[PDB]
Design a protein around this ligand. Structure first.
Ligand SMILES: *[C@@H]1O[C@H](CO)[C@@H](O[C@@H]2O[C@H](CO)[C@@H](O)[C@H](O)[C@H]2NC(C)=O)[C@H](O)[C@H]1NC(C)=O
Ligand SMILES: *[C@@H]1O[C@H](CO)[C@@H](O[C@@H]2O[C@H](CO)[C@@H](O)[C@H](O)[C@H]2NC(C)=O)[C@H](O)[C@H]1NC(C)=O
Ligand code: NAG
Ligand code: NAG
Ligand code: NAG
Ligand code: NAG
Lengths: 49, 96, 24, 276, 140, 49
C-alpha cells in the first residue's frame, strides 16, 4: 500500500505528517505491434527446387 | 497629485518599450527552458557507444558485449543529469 | 511568456497567480 | 565502338560561382519549422565549380567533349539542355573489366542501372538515331564491348522527366548529388525551370531519389553523350552526326556544417553555410 | 492505445493517433526540436501517425503522520482522474497498490488526481501543501 | 521564484529497459541524491514566493 511504500522509501517504520515523493507511476503497454512494408519480390526458390 | 498621475501614466509604456528591466524574469524562464531542452537532447548522444538507443544496442550485440555500450550510455546520461541538477542548485541559490 | 517526453516533469507552484494577485 | 570522324575541339573548362545551390535533405526525418544544424558532405556556399559545353556548330565543327573527371567524396552535377544530351553516367575505379563498375543510362522513358565489369572503349557513347526513318531509338553497341561478372541489375522508372515543354527556358535545370557512404550509393535530384538564361539565383533543396546497396569503391566518374544521325536542325542538308546545345557544371562535396531551415511543411526553405 | 511499436526497425512505446501532419513523399518518420520521434509513416498504408508517450508522472503520498493515523491520500501528478481511472480499470498503472475510490474520493487538482481526500468547500490555512492552491489536512 | 522541476532517473536514463535499469542499480544511491536536490529546490521556490 502507499503507506508501507513510503515507509520503505524513508527507510523507517514511522512516517511524520507531510507529502512524500514516493515513486513514478506509468501506464503500461497492452500489446506490441510491428509494421513492415511488404513481401517486396521474394526470392524464386521454387524455380531452383 | 498631477505629477504622480503623470508619472504613473508613463509606467505602462516605460516598462516594455525602454527594454532595460523586465528582462530578468524572461531570462529566468528562457534559462529553465534551455536547461530542460539540453537535458532531453543529451539522450541523442552516443557517448562513444554504438548508438544512443537502448534497443538498438540490445538487438545488435550479445549481452556481454552490449554491457560496455549500455554502461557508456548510463555514464553519459548520469553525467548529464548531474550537470543539470548542479546548475539548478546554483541558479536556485541565486534566485533565493 | 515563453521535455515532458522523457522523465522530466514540471510541478505547479503552491500559490496560483490568483493568490499572488490577492496578496498584492 | 565506332566513332565517326569529326573536327574535334578541346573541352573548355570555364569556372563559375556556385551561388547557394546543392542543398539536399540530409536524411528522411521530417521537421516542422525547425533550424537543424547538421554536419555533412555539402557543396560550400559561393563555391567555385567547373563548366563544360557540348554543341554542334554550323561550320562543320562539332564540340565533342568527353573529359575524365574525379569523384573524391561526393559530386554535384548540374545540366541545362533541350534534347537530353546527357544520357547517363559511369562510376568506377579503373573503368575496365578488371574491377566492378556502376553504369546508369536513361533510355527514353525507362532507366537502367548496372553494376558489372564492363569493357569500355576510348570514347564510349550511345547511338541514338532513326529506325525505318519513322522511329527514334537508341543502341548501346558503342557503350561497352562486353559485360561480364555482373552483380546488380536494375531497370525501372518509365519516366520521361522533361515533359512540360519549353515555355520559359527548357524547364531542364537538372540538379543531382551523388554520394558514396558506408557502402551505399545515394542519388539526390531536383528539376527546376530556368527563369532567365543560366544559373538563376535562388534556393531549392534536392530531394533524395535513389539508394543502392552496391558497396564497392568509387573514385572516377564520367558523363555520357550521344549523337543523332542528322535531321535535327530544319533546313540543313549536311548529312552528319550532330547534337543539340547543352551545358553542364560539376562541383564537389566538402565536409561542412549547415543550418537548414525546415518550414512548417517539412521542406527546406533556406540554409546557412557555417563557414562562409 | 498504449502499445509498443516497431516501424521498419524504429522501436518505441506510446499511443499512436491519426495525424494532420503531412510528410514529404520520401520522409519516413518525424522528429521534434529535441530530436525525439513524434510522427511515423505506416509502411503498408502510408498513413501518418502521431506518437504520444504513455502517460507517466510522480506519485506523492500524503500522510497525517503514522502515529496520528494510518490513512493516506495519493496524488498522481500531472494527469487527470479519467486517465488514472481508465488505467485502473485496465490494470495498467505501474504501482499495483491502487487506493480505494468511492466516487466521492477522486478529486481533480491542477497538480493532478488526488484520491483518498474528500474535498470540503470551506477554506482553511494550508497544512500539507499539495499544490496549485490546494492543501490537505487531517480533520473532521 | 523559478520553475520547479522533477526527474525520474530510471525513465530518463534507462527508459523501459529492464537490463539497463539492472546495471543502473549498481551505481547505488547516485539518483536518490538528485531527487532530493530537486525536491529541495521546489520547496525552496514555494518558500521564496
Ligand atoms: C504548406 O502546405 C499547406 C497545406 O497544404 C499549404 O496550405 C494550402 O495552400 C494552398 C495553396 O494553393 C491553399 O489553396 C490551401 O487552402 C492551403 N491550405 C491550408 C489548410 O491552409 C501551404 O501553402 C504550404 N506552404 C508552403 C510554403 O508550401
Ligand atoms: C503493401 O501491400 C498492401 C496489400 O494490401 C497494399 O495495400 C493496398 O494498397 C492499395 C494502394 O493504396 C489499396 O488500394 C489497397 O486497398 C490496399 N489493400 C488493402 C487490403 O488494404 C499496400 O499499399 C502495399 N504497400 C506499398 C508501399 O506498396
Ligand atoms: C575559382 O577558381 C579559379 C581558378 O583558380 C580562381 O581564380 C577563382 O578565384 C576561384 N573562385 C573562388 C570563389 O574561389
Ligand atoms: C528503349 O526505349 C525504346 C523506346 O521506347 C524501346 O523501344 C526500347 O526497347 C528500349 N530499350 C531497352 C533496352 O529497354
Ligand atoms: C577500396 O576501398 C577500400 C575500403 O576503403 C580501401 O581499403 C582500398 O584501398 C580501396 N581501393 C582503391 C583501389 O582505392
Ligand atoms: C483531463 O481530463 C479533463 C476532464 O475531462 C479535461 O478537462 C482535460 O483537458 C484533460 N487533460 C489534461 C491534460 O488535463
Amino acid at each position: 500500500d502507499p503507506l508501507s511504500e513510503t515507509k520503505c522509501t524513508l527507510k523507517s517504520f514511522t512516517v511524520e505528517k507531510g507529502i512524500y515523493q514516493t515513486s513514478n507511476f506509468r501506464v503500461q503497454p497492452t500489446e506490441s505491434i510491428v509494421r513492415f512494408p511488404n513481401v517486396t519480390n521474394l526470392c524464386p526458390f521454387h524455380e531452383v527446387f | 497629485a498631477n505629477q504622480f498621475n503623470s508619472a504613473i501614466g508613463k509606467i505602462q509604456d516605460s516598462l516594455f518599450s525602454t527594454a532595460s528591466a523586465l528582462g530578468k524574469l524572461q531570462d529566468v524562464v528562457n534559462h529553465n527552458a534551455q536547461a530542460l531542452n539540453t537535458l532531453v537532447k543529451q539522450l541523442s548522444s552516443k557517448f562513444g557507444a554504438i548508438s544512443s538507443v537502448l534497443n538498438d544496442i540490445l538487438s545488435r550485440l550479445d549481452p556481454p558485449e552490449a554491457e560496455v555500450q549500455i554502461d557508456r550510455l548510463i555514464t553519459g546520461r548520469l553525467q548529464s543529469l548531474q550537470t543539470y541538477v548542479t546548475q539548478q542548485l546554483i541558479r536556485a541559490a541565486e534566485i533565493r | 511568456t515563453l521535455q515532458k517526453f522523457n522523465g522530466l516533469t514540471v510541478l505547479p507552484p503552491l500559490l496560483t497567480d490568483e493568490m499572488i494577485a490577492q496578496y498584492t | 565502338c565506332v566513332m565517326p570522324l569529326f573536327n574535334l575541339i578541346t573541352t573548355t573548362q570555364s569556372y563559375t560561382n556556385s551561388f547557394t545551390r546543392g542543398v539536399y535533405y540530409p536524411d528522411k526525418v521530417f521537421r516542422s519549422s525547425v533550424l537543424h544544424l547538421t554536419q555533412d558532405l555539402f557543396l560550400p556556399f559561393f563555391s567555385n565549380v567547373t563548366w563544360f559545353h557540348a554543341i554542334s556548330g554550323t561550320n562543320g565543327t562539332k564540340r565533342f567533349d568527353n573529359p575524365v573527371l574525379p569523384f573524391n567524396d561526393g559530386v554535384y552535377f548540374a545540366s541545362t539542355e533541350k534534347s537530353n544530351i546527357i544520357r547517363g553516367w559511369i562510376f568506377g575505379t579503373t573503368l575496365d573489366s578488371k574491377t566492378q563498375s556502376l553504369l546508369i543510362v536513361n533510355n527514353a522513358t525507362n532507366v537502367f542501372i548496372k553494376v558489372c565489369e564492363f569493357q569500355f572503349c576510348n570514347d564510349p557513347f550511345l547511338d541514338v538515331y532513326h529506325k525505318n526513318n519513322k522511329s527514334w531509338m537508341e543502341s548501346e553497341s558503342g557503350v561497352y564491348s562486353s559485360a561480364n561478372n555482373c552483380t546488380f541489375e536494375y531497370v525501372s522508372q518509365p519516366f520521361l522527366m522533361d515533359l512540360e515543354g519549353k515555355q520559359g527556358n527548357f524547364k531542364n535545370l537538372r540538379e543531382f548529388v551523388f554520394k558514396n557512404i558506408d557502402g551505399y550509393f545515394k542519388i539526390y535530384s531536383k528539376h527546376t525551370p530556368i527563369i532567365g538564361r543560366d544559373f538563376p539565383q535562388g534556393f531549392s533543396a534536392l530531394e533524395p531519389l535513389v539508394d543502392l546497396p552496391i558497396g564497392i569503391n568509387i573514385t572516377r566518374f564520367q558523363t555520357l553523350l550521344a549523337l543523332n544521325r542528322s535531321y535535327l536542325t530544319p533546313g540543313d542538308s549536311s548529312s552528319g552526326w550532330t547534337a543539340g546545345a547543352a551545358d553542364y557544371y560539376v562541383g564537389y562535396l566538402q565536409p561542412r556544417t549547415f543550418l537548414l531551415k525546415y518550414n512548417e511543411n517539412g521542406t527546406i526553405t533556406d540554409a546557412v553555410d557555417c563557414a562562409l | 492505445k498504449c502499445v509498443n511499436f516497431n516501424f521498419n526497425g524504429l522501436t518505441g512505446t506510446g499511443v499512436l493517433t491519426k495525424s494532420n501532419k503531412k510528410f514529404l513523399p520520401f520522409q519516413q518518420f518525424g522528429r521534434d526540436i529535441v530530436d525525439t520521434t513524434d510522427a511515423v509513416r505506416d509502411p503498408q498504408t502510408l498513413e501518418i501517425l502521431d506518437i504520444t508517450p504513455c502517460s507517466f508522472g510522480g506519485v506523492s503520498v500524503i500522510t497525517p503522520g503514522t502515529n496520528t493515523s494510518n490513512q493516506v491520500a495519493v496524488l498522481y501528478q500531472g494527469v487527470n482522474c479519467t486517465e488514472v481511472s481508465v488505467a485502473i480499470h485496465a490494470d495498467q498503472l505501474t504501482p499495483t497498490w491502487r487506493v480505494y475510490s468511492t466516487g466521492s474520493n477522486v478529486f481533480q487538482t491542477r497538480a493532478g488526481c488526488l484520491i483518498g481526500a474528500e474535498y470540503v468547500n470551506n477554506s482553511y490555512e494550508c497544512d500539507i501543501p499539495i499544490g496549485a492552491g490546494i492543501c490537505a489536512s487531517y480533520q473532521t | 521564484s523559478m520553475t520547479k522541476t522533477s526527474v525520474d532517473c530510471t525513465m530518463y536514463i534507462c527508459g523501459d529497459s529492464t537490463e539497463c535499469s539492472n546495471l543502473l542499480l549498481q551505481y547505488g544511491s547516485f539518483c536518490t541524491q538528485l531527487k532530493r536536490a530537486l525536491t529541495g529546490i521546489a520547496v525552496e521556490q514555494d518558500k521564496n514566493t
